[PDB]
C-alpha cells in the first residue's frame, strides 16, 4: 500500500537512538580537535590534537647517514599540519550539524542522506586509521617532516652516501614515525625521483607506537559506524519499499 508508516517510524525508532550516536561522535571528535596530553630509534614525539607540531624521535637505519644513526632531532620543535585528524574532525562536525538540523527534518530522505554521509565519513576515518595516508606513507612521503622540520635534516636525511628520509607509520590506528635508508641512486625498483634523488632501499628502522588518545577515539568511531550501518540499512529499507 504505502510505506508512509515506515518513513515516519524513524522518529519512534531512529530518534530515540539519535542522541546516543550524536553525543558519542561529538565526544570522539572533541579529543582529535583539541590539545591533549601525548639498532633502534630513540626519543618520542607528541601530536597536539589534529596537527602534530612536536617531534623528538631519531633514526637508526644501518644504511642511513653513511652508517651513522640519523638523530634528526627537531630544532626545538616547529609548527606542522596533519590532515589525518583534520578530515575526521570535519566529518564529525558535519555529522553533528546534520544530527542537529535534519533530526527534525520534515522529509526522512534528508535525515537518511545525512546519516549515510556521516557513516561513510566514519568508515573513511577508520580506513585512514588502518593504513597511513597517501602523503604520509614512506614511498609517497618525499621525506616530509624529516627534511626541513627536523634540525640539520638536509644531511640527517639526505646524506651523500645514502638518504635517510623519514616517514609516518600511521598503519596501527595510532601515530608513529619511522624511516628507511637508501643508498644514492638515479645519478625503477630503487626509485625515480625520491626527494629529487632516487635512493635504492638498503635498510629500515620501522618502529610501531600506540596512540593513548587516538585508540579510544578510533574504537568509539568504529562502534558508532557499526551502529550507523544497521541504522542506515533500516532507513534505506523503507525508502526501497515505497
Amino acid at each position: 500500500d504505502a510505506v508512509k508508516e515506515c518513513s515516519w517510524l524513524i522518529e519512534e525508532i531512529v530518534k530515540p537512538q539519535l542522541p546516543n550516536i550524536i553525543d558519542n561522535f561529538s565526544k570522539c571528535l572533541e579529543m582529535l580537535e583539541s590539545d591533549q596530553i601525548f639498532p633502534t630509534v630513540k626519543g618520542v614525539i607528541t601530536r597536539q590534537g589534529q596537527y602534530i607540531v612536536d617531534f623528538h624521535i631519531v633514526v637508526r637505519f644501518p644504511q642511513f647517514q653513511r652508517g651513522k644513526q640519523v638523530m634528526f632531532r627537531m630544532n626545538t620543535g616547529l609548527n606542522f599540519l596533519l590532515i589525518q585528524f583534520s578530515k575526521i574532525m570535519t566529518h564529525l562536525k558535519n555529522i553533528l550539524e546534520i544530527l542537529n538540523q535534519l533530526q527534525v527534518a520534515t522529509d526522512v530522505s534528508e535525515f537518511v542522506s545525512k546519516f549515510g554521509v556521516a557513516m561513510e565519513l566514519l568508515n573513511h576515518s577508520l580506513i585512514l586509521l588502518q593504513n597511513p595516508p597517501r602523503d604520509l606513507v614512506f614511498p609517497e612521503d618525499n621525506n616530509f617532516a624529516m627534511k626541513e622540520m627536523f634540525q640539520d635534516c638536509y644531511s640527517v636525511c639526505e646524506s651523500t652516501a645514502h638518504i635517510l628520509g623519514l616517514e609516518l607509520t600511521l598503519c596501527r590506528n595510532e601515530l608513529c614515525i619511522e624511516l628507511r635508508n637508501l643508498i644514492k641512486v638515479t645519478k625503477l625498483r630503487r626509485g625515480v625521483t625520491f626527494d629529487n634523488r632516487v635512493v635504492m632501499e638498503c635498510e629500515k628502522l620501522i618502529v610501531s607506537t600506540s596512540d593513548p588518545t587516538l585508540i579510544s577515539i578510533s574504537a568509539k568511531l568504529n562502534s558508532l559506524k557499526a551502529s550507523m550501518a544497521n541504522h542506515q540499512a533500516n532507513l534505506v529499507a523503507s525508502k526501497q519499499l515505497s
Binding site: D1, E5, C6, L9, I13, N234
Partner: protein
C-alpha cells in the same frame, strides 16, 4: 476407552492453536470462541477454561507448562495447579494488561518471558513473590500497524515481528546486555513479498546459559520461496542476511519444518545412519494434490558458517485428508513427537473451516526414499457446535444426527470413523426461522422434516457447501388447547422413500398424520386418534431401532399413564386411504404410577425410572414381567436403547455426569 471429544470450533487466528512438549506430556491447546481447550495426555483427557471474551491467541511454555491466553485488551496466564502429575490440570494464576489495544498475537519464551504484541510489542516476565507471578513490563515500543504474527526465541536472539501483509520483519534483538529495562536493537530483514509464515529453530540443550549462536530463522515469503536466515552472537554482529533459499515449485503451496530436535528424539543411532540426514533439520513441501517432497538441509545449524543448501530426501504423496481439505489457509503448529511413542510425529493441521486434524506421521516412513504413498492416518479431529445443543435427534437408521438449540443454529452431523474410535462430522446446517420443537430425519440424513414451536412444519433437502435448502413448508392452527409432544415417522406398509407420513401426537390423541414429501407438498390425514388413556398423555416415549431395518411391523410409541398402564401402540396406515390406524400391540400394566423417564427398544424391552428417579425397572413388553430392578444413589437423567439385526440390545442409563451401559445376561440354568 476410545472416547473422542468435540470441544469447540477453533478460531481463525494464526496462533489459535499451539502443540507444546512440556515434560513430554505433549500438551495441545487451542481457542474456541469464549473457551480455551487443553488436551493433555495423548489427547485422551480434556480441560476447558471459560472466559467471557473471544480468545485471540494461545501459547504454551515448553519449560514449565504455563499457558498464555490472549483476549480483548488483556491476557491471562494459567499454570499447572500441580507442577508435576500423571493428570495435569490448569488454573488461573495471573493477569496481563498494558494498554487499550487487543493482543493480536502472543507467545512464550524462556523463564516466564512473553512477547505480548498487540500493536505495541510489549515484552514481559512473570514469576515472583512466593507464587504471585506478578508480571514486569520489561520493555515496550510501538509498531507501524497491529502485529499479525510474532515470534520469540530464547536468550539474546530475542524477538521478531511482521505485521499483516508486511514485507519486512522487524527483528528486535536483546540489545542491552543487562538491566530489566533492556532496549531492543532493530533490523528490517526485507523480503520480496509479504510473509506467509515464520519460526525459529529449536535448541533447548543450550540452557540454562542460553548464550548460543546459529539461531536460524525460518521465513516463507509470499513469492513461493522459503528462506533461512543465519544468526549468531558475534557481539550482536549477526545477523540480517539470508543464509539459504528454497524456491517451491508451482504445484507446492504449503511448507513445514521438522527440527533436528524431533529427529534426534525419534531416530536411533543405528537407524540414523540412513538416510544419514541427522546433521540438520528437515523440510516438507506439500501441495493440495497431496504429493509432497521432503528434503534435508546441509549444515543449517553449524556454528561456523557453512554453505547451506537443500538436499532432497524423498518424494511422498498421501490421501486428501492427509494434507488439506481444500482449505484457503492452513496453520500448522510445530510438529512434535507424540510423547514417548518413538517413531511417531504428532503432525497437526488447522483447516480454518472449523476442523483441526491430528495425523501421527511415522518419521521412518516419511524419509524412506524407496517408499510408496504417505502412511499418515487421521487420528483425531477437533471441532464443535456453534453455540449450544438443546437436544439431539437421532435418525432411526442411526446414521445421522440433528443438533437443535434454543436458536436457529441446527446442524446435521454424520458419524465418522477415525483411526481412533469414532467421531461426528458436521455435514449440513438446517437454518430455521424459530427453534425446532420436534424433528425427524430420513433419507440417510439427506432429507429432514421438523416442527417449530411456532407450529410450522418444514422440510429441507441436504444433498451436499453446507447449505440446507428448504424445499417445503406448511403451518398448523395452534389452537392453544392441545399441543404436540412427539413426532413419529409411521413407516409405510411397504418400503417407500417418496413420502414419509409423519404423525404429530397432540397430547391426548389427535394424531395429525401429515403425508409430508418433497417432490409434492405436505398434506393432512384424518385417521386417527388413539386412546389417550385418560385424556392426557403422560410422558410418551418413542421406540426406534438404531440400525437399517426396513420392517414396517413394529411398535412405535410406548405410552404410559400416571396409573402405570404402559401401552406400546403399533402403526398402520394406508397411502390410498390417506388415513392411519393406531393398534395397541402391548398393554403391560406397570407397577409404578409416577415415572421419571420411560423408553423402549425394538426388541420388546422397556425401561422406566420411578417417580423418585433413583430406581430403574426393566420390563419385558412381550411378557409384562419386570426383568430387572436396580437402585441408584443418583437420579436417572435419561435412558436410551440401542439394537442390531442380531438382537444385541444395550441400554444406556444417563446419570448426572456419567452414563452406565447395561446388557442382557443369559439365564444361567445352574446358578443365580
Amino acid at each position: 476407552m476410545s472416547l473422542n471429544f468435540l470441544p469447540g470450533r477453533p478460531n481463525a487466528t494464526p496462533q489459535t492453536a499451539c502443540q507444546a512438549t512440556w515434560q513430554n506430556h505433549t500438551i495441545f491447546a487451542y481457542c474456541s470462541g469464549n473457551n480455551l481447550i487443553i488436551l493433555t495426555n495423548k489427547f485422551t483427557r480434556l480441560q476447558t477454561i471459560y472466559t467471557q471474551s473471544d480468545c485471540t491467541a494461545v501459547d504454551i511454555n515448553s519449560q514449565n507448562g504455563f499457558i498464555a491466553l490472549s483476549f480483548h485488551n488483556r491476557v491471562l496466564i494459567y499454570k499447572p495447579i500441580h507442577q508435576i502429575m500423571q493428570n495435569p490440570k490448569w488454573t488461573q494464576c495471573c493477569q496481563l494488561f498494558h494498554d487499550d489495544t487487543p493482543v493480536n498475537c502472543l507467545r512464550w519464551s524462556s523463564d516466564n518471558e512473553l512477547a505480548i504484541g498487540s500493536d505495541f510489542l510489549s515484552f514481559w516476565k512473570i514469576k515472583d513473590n512466593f507464587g504471585v507471578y506478578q508480571p514486569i513490563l520489561q520493555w515496550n515500543q510501538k509498531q507501524p500497524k497491529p502485529v499479525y504474527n510474532v515470534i520469540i526465541s530464547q536468550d539474546s536472539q530475542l524477538i521478531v515481528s511482521i505485521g499483516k501483509y508486511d514485507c519486512n520483519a522487524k527483528l528486535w534483538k536483546r540489545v542491552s546486555i543487562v538491566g530489566e529495562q533492556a532496549i531492543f536493537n532493530l533490523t528490517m530483514l526485507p523480503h520480496p513479498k509479504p510473509i506467509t509464515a515464520m519460526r525459529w529453530k529449536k535448541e533447548p540443550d543450550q540452557v540454562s546459559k542460553n548464550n548460543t549462536a546459529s539461531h536460524a530463522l525460518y521465513t516463507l515469503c509470499e513469492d513461493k520461496v522459503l528462506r533461512i536466515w543465519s544468526c549468531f552472537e558475534m557481539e550482536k554482529n549477526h545477523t540480517v542476511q539470508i543464509w539459504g533459499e528454497v524456491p517451491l515449485s508451482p504445484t507446492q503451496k504449503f511448507c513445514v519444518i521438522i527440527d533436528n530436535w524431533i529427529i534426534r528424539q525419534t531416530l536411533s543411532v543405528k537407524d540414523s545412519e540412513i538416510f544419514d540426514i541427522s546433521d540438520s533439520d528437515i523440510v516438507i513441501l506439500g501441495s493440495m494434490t497431496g504429493e509432497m517432497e521432503v528434503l534435508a538441509l546441509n549444515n543449517l545449524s553449524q556454528d561456523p558458517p557453512k554453505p547451506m543448501t537443500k538436499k532432497t530426501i524423498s518424494h511422498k504423496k498421501v490421501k486428501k485428508a492427509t494434507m488439506l481439505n481444500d482449505t484457503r489457509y492452513l496453520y500448522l503448529p510445530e510438529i512434535q513427537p507424540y510423547d514417548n511413542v518413538k517413531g511417531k510425529l504428532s503432525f497437526l493441521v488447522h483447516d480454518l473451516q472449523g476442523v483441526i486434524r491430528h495425523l501421527l506421521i511415522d518419521i521412518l516412513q516419511l524419509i524412506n526414499n524407496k517408499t510408496e504413498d504417505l502412511s499418515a492416518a487421521l487420528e483425531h479431529k477437533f471441532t464443535g457446535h456453534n453455540k449450544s445443543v438443546q437436544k439431539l435427534v437421532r435418525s432411526s437408521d442411526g446414521e445421522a444426527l440433528l443438533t437443535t438449540s434454543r436458536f436457529s443454529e441446527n446442524g446435521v452431523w454424520y458419524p465418522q470413523k477415525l483411526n481412533h474410535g469414532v467421531s461426528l462430522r458436521l455435514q449440513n446446517t438446517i437454518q430455521t426461522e424459530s427453534p425446532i420443537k420436534f424433528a425427524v430425519v430420513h433419507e440417510l440424513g439427506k432429507q429432514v422434516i421438523c416442527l417449530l414451536e411456532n407450529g410450522a412444519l418444514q422440510a429441507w433437502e441436504c444433498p451436499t457447501q453446507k447449505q440446507s435448502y428448504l424445499r417445503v413448508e406448511t403451518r398448523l392452527k395452534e389452537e392453544k388447547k392441545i399441543h404436540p409432544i412427539v413426532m413419529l415417522n409411521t413407516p409405510e406398509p411397504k418400503h417407500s422413500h417418496e413420502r414419509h407420513f409423519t404423525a404429530l401426537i397432540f397430547s391426548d390423541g389427535s394424531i395429525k398424520a401429515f403425508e409430508v414429501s418433497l417432490t409434492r407438498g405436505i398434506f393432512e390425514v384424518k385417521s386417527d386418534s388413539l386412546d389417550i388413556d385418560g385424556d392426557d398423555i403422560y410422558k410418551i416415549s418413542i421406540i426406534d431401532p438404531v440400525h437399517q431395518t426396513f420392517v414396517s411391523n413394529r411398535p412405535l410409541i410406548s405410552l404410559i399413564t400416571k396409573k402405570g398402564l404402559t401401552r406400546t401402540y403399533k402403526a398402520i396406515v394406508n397411502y390410498n386411504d390417506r388415513h392411519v390406524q393406531w393398534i395397541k400391540a402391548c398393554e403391560i400394566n406397570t407397577g409404578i404410577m409416577n415415572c421419571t423417564c420411560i423408553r423402549g427398544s425394538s426388541t420388546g424391552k422397556l425401561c422406566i425410572v420411578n417417580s423418585t428417579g433413583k430406581v430403574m425397572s426393566l420390563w419385558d413388553l412381550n411378557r409384562g414381567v419386570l426383568e430387572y430392578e436396580e437402585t441408584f444413589h443418583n437420579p436417572i437423567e435419561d435412558i436410551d436403547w440401542t439394537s442390531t439385526e442380531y438382537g444385541q440390545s444395550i441400554v444406556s442409563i444417563g446419570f448426572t455426569g456419567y452414563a452406565l451401559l447395561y446388557t442382557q445376561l443369559r439365564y444361567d440354568y445352574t446358578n443365580n
